[PDB]
Amino acid sequence: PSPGKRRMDTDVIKLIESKHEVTILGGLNEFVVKFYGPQGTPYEGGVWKVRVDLPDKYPFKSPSIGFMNKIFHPNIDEASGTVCLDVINQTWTALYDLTNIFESFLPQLLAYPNPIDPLNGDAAAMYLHRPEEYKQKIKEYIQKYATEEALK
Amino acid sequence: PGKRRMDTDVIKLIESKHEVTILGGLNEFVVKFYGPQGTPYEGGVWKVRVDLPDKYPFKSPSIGFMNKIFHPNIDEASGTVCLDVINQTWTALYDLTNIFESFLPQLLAYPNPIDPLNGDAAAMYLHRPEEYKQKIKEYIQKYATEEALKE
Ligand code: NA
């Protein structure tokens, strides 16, 4: 097995053993993690199933990250749930710790979006101009799509 | 009243020496901003985007550098100025001309010790001031001259 493949297995097992709750799909290159909205943000209270796919060229190429249940955020395509790959790539390196996607990358993205060049223009505009509507829109999406109730 | 303040604060900024481009409306615009004399930013040129929230001026503007800048309280990738740092200076009677005449030059002269948005910039500022200045100089030449802005 390649250095890249050895890293995939080691990385994913490391992630499985972490505090993060992992469900494996087709194999170790596709898993889903239960992710909780960060405290002190409009996402607080939300629960999401975040799917991660690892490319064959991992870890040189970054994982792709998608929210399987709906989220409203300037840098996440609403209809697909896909996190902006340019944003992931600003953080990702060949030695970046996969567990930090959940501990560090995603909490910080949700807390502090980049509303310039957004994947969700609606969310970006509200973020910048109507922060109270932005927060309320997120709270409504949480109640409709991102509670334990909604997920079952 | 707040909206009356938005319209007149923006029109005053338009009337001032500061060069303003309006984007979607009076609540979003870009101002051409020159690095303050006697700081490591001296000589740099930036396009600074300001967005005004509906409850302005009770709520502060958000402020982003549209071409790259290296500073502890500014997120390098997005150009976003730390909103907590903005809020420490913002009041309901603060206006827009002072964002450019007072707030931003004082911030570029004196980074704020609030948890940094640029950790690399904070570490250099604090422990390697000479490398901090050199890196800013390099970023200015690369991202923040009139020529770099044309491109
Ligand atoms: Na003007």
Layout of strands and helices, then pairs:
2 copies of one chain form a homodimer.
Chain A: H1 3-17, E1 22-27, E2 30-36, E3 47-53, E4 64-67, H2 85-91, H3 100-111, H4 121-129, H5 131-145, H6 148-151
Antiparallel strand pairs in A: 1-2, 2-3, 3-4
GO molecular function, one term (chain A): ubiquitin-protein transferase activity
Enzyme class (chain A): transferase
EC number (chain A): 2.3.2.23, 2.3.2.24
Provide the succession of SSEs of chain A.
HEEEEHHHHH
The side-by-side strand order for the widest beta sheet of chain A comes to 1-2-3-4
- How helix-rich are the residues of chain A, as a percent range? 40-55%
How many structural domains can be distinguished in the coordinates of chain A? 1
* Topology, number of strands of chain A: 4
What oligomeric state is this? homodimer
Unique bound compounds: sodium ion
Name given to the CATH architecture of chain A: Roll
- For this structure, the CATH topology of chain A is Ubiquitin Conjugating Enzyme
Largest interface: A-B, 10 and 17 residues
CATH class of chain A: Alpha Beta
| Total of DSSP H or I helical runs spanning 4+ residues of chain A | 6
Characterize the overall form of chain A. Answer: globular
**Termini separation of chain A:** 39 Å
Rg of chain A (CA only):
15 Å
Biggest sheet architecture of chain A: 4 strands, antiparallel
Active site (chain B): 82 (glycyl thioester intermediate)
EC number (chain B): 2.3.2.23, 2.3.2.24
GO molecular function (chain B): ATP binding; ubiquitin conjugating enzyme activity; ubiquitin-protein transferase activity
Modified residues (N6-acetyllysine) (chain B): 55
